[PDB]
Amino acid sequence: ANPQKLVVALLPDESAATVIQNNKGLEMYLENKLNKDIELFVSTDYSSMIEVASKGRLDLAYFGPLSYVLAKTKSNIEPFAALEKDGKNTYQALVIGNAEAGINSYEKIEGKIMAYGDQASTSSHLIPKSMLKQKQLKAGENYEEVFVGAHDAVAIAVANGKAQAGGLSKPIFTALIERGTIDKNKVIIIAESKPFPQYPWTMRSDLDSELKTQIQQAFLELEDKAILKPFKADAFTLVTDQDYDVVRNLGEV
DSSP states (O other), rough: OSSSEEEEEOOOOOOOHHHHHHHHHHHHHHHHHHHHHEEEEEEESHHHHHHHTTTTTSSSOOOOOHHHHHHHHHSSSEEEEEETTTTTTOOOEEEHHHHHHHTSSGGGGGSSSSEEEOOOOOOHHHHHHHHHHHOOOTTTTTEEEEESHHHHHHHHHHHSSSSSSSEEEEHHHHHHHTTSOOOOOGGEEEOOOOOEEOOOEEETTTTTTTHHHHHHHHHHHOOOOOHHHTOOOEEEOOOOGGGGHHHHHHHHH
């Protein structure tokens, strides 16, 4: 209940060095506020994060929405905060196409290779897959799916031409363009999803009351631009479990 050190896991939605480096600023702030030491953990894939969480081995975990839903079925954890941008607490998936191949509509996806990220990804699997299904594209019926493991790997493949289309997170696509990792004109945005709730920061439920409240507070109070720059976020807001029922519903269907 009162750990001297805090194990903090971060979703491997991109390469580990990108993820680690994005949260370094936030790690330092949380050391100063909680007066505790933090070791970051970035798993090899989303499923191994979910496993590590299900051992009671993590103190905090920054999960994606679907991965949170899956981890919560077998882990004693509690969502408490999520990024806010422009007083909004949500985010979008994109469907993108390879521009050389002229992949600029849903109809051009038919009979081609569609890149997804991790199988437990919300915005690089579940969401883009539902968007494709609403448009009568079904995996292994009228197109071929490949799982390339991460959002940055999706962007890379689609821009390369190894895949003709892909599904990934709109903020990650945006960061990738701004950092120069991907050339913008090699990819065409086909569609954007509806709003889904942002990734939940979660904590272990059997943590001490006063520590749980201190952690939540630390997030809610954070205001400086430099620390949130790698997420293009103005703040954190609070979230609860029920906010993820929209994701469960889509996961059910």
